[PDB]
Amino acid sequence: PLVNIYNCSGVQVGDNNYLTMQ
Amino acid sequence: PLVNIYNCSGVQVGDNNYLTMQ
Amino acid sequence: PLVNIYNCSGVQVGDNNYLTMQ
């Protein structure tokens, strides 16, 4: 359920097409 | 379900066309 | 379903044309 991330870059709950960045 | 992210950058629940940033 | 993000930058549920930023 709740995550409360407040990050500062790439993230994903988790599913198809895994993210990237640079 | 609920996520409650409050992040400060790129983020995907998770699906096709995985995100990018710079 | 519900996400309740309240972030402060780029984000996407997840689909085609993965986002960018700078």
Nearest CA in chain A to B21: A21
Do C6 and B5 contact (CB within 8 A), yes or no? yes
The answer to whether the Cβ–Cβ distance between A8 and B9 falls below 8 Å is yes
* DSSP, res C3: -
Q: Is B19 exposed, middle or buried (0-12, 13-18, 19+ CB in 10 A)?
A: buried
Indicate the resolution in Å. 4.6
How was this structure obtained?
cryo-EM
Nearest by CB to residue B15, choosing from A2, A3, A15, is A15
Between CA A7 and CA A18, with CA A12 as vertex, the angle to 5 degrees is 130
* Span between the terminal Cα atoms of chain C, in Å: 28
